[PDB]
Every structure is written in structure tokens, then in C-alpha cells.
Amino acid sequence: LTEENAKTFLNNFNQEAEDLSYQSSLASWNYNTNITEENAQKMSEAAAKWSAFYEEQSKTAQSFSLQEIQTPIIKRQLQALQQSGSSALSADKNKQLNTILNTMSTIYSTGKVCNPKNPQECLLLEPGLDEIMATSTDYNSRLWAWEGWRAEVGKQLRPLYEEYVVLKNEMARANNYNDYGDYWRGDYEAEGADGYNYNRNQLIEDVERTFAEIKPLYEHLHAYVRRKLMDTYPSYISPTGCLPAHLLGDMWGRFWTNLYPLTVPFAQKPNIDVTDAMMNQGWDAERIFQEAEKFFVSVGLPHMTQGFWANSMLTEPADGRKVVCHPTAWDLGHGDFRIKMCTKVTMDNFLTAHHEMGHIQYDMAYARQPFLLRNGANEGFHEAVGEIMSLSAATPKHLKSIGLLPSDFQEDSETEINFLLKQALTIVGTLPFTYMLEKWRWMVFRGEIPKEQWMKKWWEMKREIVGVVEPLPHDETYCDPASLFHVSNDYSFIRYYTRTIYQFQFQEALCQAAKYNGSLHKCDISNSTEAGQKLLKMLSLGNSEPWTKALENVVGARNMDVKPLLNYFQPLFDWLKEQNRNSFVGWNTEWSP
């Protein structure tokens, strides 16, 4: 029978796959920790063999018909295996798409904007332009950096995007998807028992529904930020107008976190930073991970493996091997879990360690599941589980409990307000940009936006949704979205929006589980074993079950809810309402200085 044949095929596949995947992951780890040409070539062969085996199994797997398979776990495993991805197209088309992707990656990596009338001062984005966006207060210098990078990247990348969209559309249609946007929205598709069914088309409306609720808080935040920037820039920002694109503290306006010194509520009150306390007590990276482990055992999740301590790098090696600065959590397979982080003794690294350990715990929980189902329920869940631990770690109660913060510390309202505003600038601010960018990409892939009117649509939506106006008029020869890293390198962007909703929903569910009686932002989930079990039920599942079922398992709801997000920011929202009474909340679409 077909189902038994599929079960035997999956049984053979899991044993062969786990070994090949471990070899590929180990080679990738060996390159990442010890960067060299030989480790890179070894990684290349390991990845090539693993990819070739995966495609060969996928081609055999496609012969099976899903109609006569009744058991959901086997059907889900076959669905995961049967995703051809880029292999659906012909060799010529696949090679052309790969060439376009590689040239886009190299051109973005090597992007150059240079000073007019000062030829020697030519700046790359990664070493210096980002520093200019984060720190510089000069209007003209920011205008130059934004316009120059926009002009060079957009003019070079506009044809490449024009054929990139067509090739992605062909690949998606070849894979029985309406457009590339539908292919991205497929990741959230869940097929399951009645009432757990989720559709790709549904996701857009769900995002819009969440956005409408988020919109008053964003509008109040935008008005407050606009007033503070107006204080910083006296005549270049209008009271009723949108914010200029180059004054948002980032190259693209993705994060508003760099506007915090300009937009601080209380300059006099210090931050909750505990780096100096770590310096005084002689803390090190090993202690940081041990404290994170203590938190995870205290909440009731299992202890870290011996292999994790033995094989991971938690410090810069300083023995002559090049390393990647970025913290990454690796699930190599066969019970091997590692973290690559160059940990300095700071509060931010401590939170990052909690986030990466959360990733490792998430990976560890679903190790029991079969190989194809050893993944997150969706892209958002994996980031969200780390983010909730990062939220819990940063609370003043947690810092006092572990002795980082003094026992006699007084928590006034003002520190809560400025901390919440910083969290909003990092977290709330990114959401309109994420929604607008994803909506633009989906409509471009769909063809709802006409080909020759792309720029004209995008700024309008930025005027409509983000409430940010262009500093200078841009015609259609520009490709203004393509300057972002995620779009130029073919990465989905809706995961951050889903991550943001899931993070607060999970945090409220755990706090209700832990019987916390106070404000959500002050909540700590330490020493609440029932909350750990409630979380662990979702963590064990992986993607074996529909993501709606996992969401119901933690929060009791089957869809995205932003009521926890509003609940988290409620004191800040009240404060923003209190201080915006004189001012006008909202923006006008037409360009105002």
C-alpha cells in the first residue's frame, strides 16, 4: 500500500539524511569557527552532497500521491520533502536566477557611495555609512548618505529586480503557486483537523487586522518622535507632515532604536544597564551562560548538554583563527547543540545569550520528532521563543534576584517609561516598515502594482502606512526597496512581524501561567515550572502539528493577537496619550516640509 511504502521510504530517509545533515552542519561549523580556504571547500563538498541527496530523495518522494495518505505526520513529512524550491525551473533559467542572486549579493556587499568634491573619502555601507545613520545629527550629511546609496543601488539594481521578479514568478508558478508572494505565504499554511486550517490568502487579511489595532499606538509614537525630531531639527520637519526618510536613525528606517538619545523621555534618569556591575564582580562569558542555564532549569526546561559546554565557543579564540562576530545557534543533529557567540561581558550580550540558549532549547525539545519535522512551527516561532527569554532576562526583578542589581533598588515610573519607549522604538517602529515592505513585495509579485509605476506606489504607501515621506522626489529609474539587505538577498520579511506578535502573546500566556499579578513589562517567568511545561508542550511538537494548534497550546488562541502587545505597552501608551494632547496625532499624505 502507498502509505506503508511512504513510511518505509521515510524510515530509510531519516537514517541517511541525519548523517549527511550532520556532516554538512559540522563542516559549516568548522568553517564558521576556523575561517580558511580548506574548511570552505570541505563545507562546499558537504553541502553539495547533502543537496544532491536531498534533491534525489525529493524526486523519488514526488512519485507518491498525497490523496491516499491518511496519517497527518507522514503527510506533513512528505509535504516537507516534496518542496522542490528552485529546482523546478529548467537549467538555463535556474542558472540565470542563480547568477542574478550572486551578482546582487556581491554588489550589495561591495556597495560604494563616495563624497562629492572629496574623492578620497569613499564609504562602504557596512564599516561607516551605518555609523553615520546611527550617530550623525547633521541633516545634510544624512541626506547625502541616504540619497547617494539610494541612487547607486537603485540605478544598478532596477533591471536586475525587473528580471528577478519574472524568474521568481516562473519558479513559483512551476511549483503550483500563484506568485512568489504566495510561495512565501506558503510557509504559514497549515493543513490539519477542522478549525485548524490556515490558508495563504488569509495571512494578508490577518496582518491587516492586526495592523489596524497597532495603528493608534504607532500614531502616538510617531507624533512624539516627530515632536522630538522637530526639537532636534527646527525648520526641516513640519508638525502635520510625515517624517523625513533619512532622520529615522537607520539607513532604511527599519529600526528607530538609534533615535533614543534624541527622543529620551527623562534624560536625567540613567538606564538599567548592569555592565559595570558585571565588571566589578568579575563575571565572564561562562558565568553568563551558566546564569542563563540556571534560569532555564528554574523555569523547568532541561539542563544544557555536556557536549554544548565542551564544543561551543563562548569567547573570541585569539589563537589566529578568523571568526564570525554574529551570534548563531547551531543544531548540528544527533543531539549536538552548539552556540557560536563572541561574548563580551555586557548586558546586551547577556540578553543575546538568553536568546540563543532559547533557540538551543527549542531545537533540543523537538529532537524526538522525525528529521523532516525537526523545525519550528513557522519562521516566527523560532525567533519568538528566544525573544521571550530575552524579555524575561532584562527585567529588574531578574537582575535583582541574581545579584546584578542591588537589593535596595527603587523602580520609579520614569525608568519604566523610558525603557518601554526604547522597546517601542526597536519593536513597535519596525512593524509599519515590515508590513509596508511585505505588502509591496506581495503586490509586485502578484502584478497588482503596474510595472512602470513601482516607485510611485511605494512612496504613497510609505506616506499612507509608515507615515514617512521621501526627502527628494524619486522617479521610476530608482529601485528604492532594493537597497535593503533582505530584499536583495531573497529573504522573507514577514517573519519579524509574526515574531513580534508571537513574542508578546507567548509572554502574556506564560505570565498568566505563572500567576503574575502586575504589569506585563515587569513580569519574570523564573521559578514557574507550570509555565515551563506549558511552553514545553509547544516546544516538543516542532512542526509535527499545525502552528495554530501550537499557538492554541500556549495562548489558547488560533490566530495572531496584538492585545498582548498593547497590554505590554499600556503605561507607555497612556503616557504618550497624556503628552500628545496639544499636538496633532497623525500625518498628512501630501509632502510637508
Binding site: Q512, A513, E552, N553, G556
Partner: protein
């Protein structure tokens, strides 16, 4: 004033009593200890009335359970005094001593 348990998570073991009044959680959402939809208080009231049918009238039940253990048995039925006859040859059973 007569109550019964209508809802319990698991069946009772023999000779077990549960006095808990905790709200019975039949749904995924936590009850939170306040009655709410899909959350029902376990103990229901037997609203006895004189005009009810014979099936529903209140009945008092006493269950007698007898157990034997390695310890000497100290609950036994009544001992017959009978009567005492003297000066004749009679079979005598005095405190379990026979002759």
C-alpha cells in the same frame, strides 16, 4: 444541602473521596478559578422535592465493608447466654472450652 460531583478529571479509585471544589476545566483556555464559558463548577445540587418520581426521590445508603487483617479479629456477632443446668451430664461449652 445534598451535593454530588458531576465533573472530575479522572475516575475515582475504590474507597476514595475528593473534597475539592476546583472549577472543572473542559477547555484549552485556563478557567482562572472564576466560573466562565466551558468552565463548570464540579459539585451540583440534588434539588430534592416531595413530589418527585420514585426514581428521583432521596434514598439513604449505608455501605458496610468488612475487612480481615493479620491482627486478631475484634468485631464478632452476639454470643448466646443460653442457660445453665447443673447436677446432670450436659455437654458444656465455656468460653470455647468444650467437653
Amino acid at each position: 444541602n445534598y451535593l454530588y460531583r458531576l465533573f472530575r478529571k479522572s475516575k475515582l479509585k475504590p474507597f476514595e473521596r475528593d473534597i475539592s471544589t476546583e472549577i472543572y476545566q473542559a477547555g484549552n483556555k485556563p478557567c482562572n478559578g472564576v466560573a466562565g464559558p466551558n468552565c463548570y463548577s464540579p459539585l451540583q445540587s440534588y434539588g430534592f422535592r416531595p413530589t418527585y418520581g420514585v426514581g428521583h426521590q432521596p434514598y439513604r445508603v449505608v455501605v458496610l465493608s468488612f475487612e480481615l487483617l493479620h491482627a486478631p479479629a475484634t468485631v464478632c456477632g452476639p454470643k448466646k447466654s443460653t442457660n445453665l443446668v447443673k447436677n446432670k451430664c450436659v455437654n458444656f461449652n465455656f468460653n470455647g472450652l468444650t467437653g
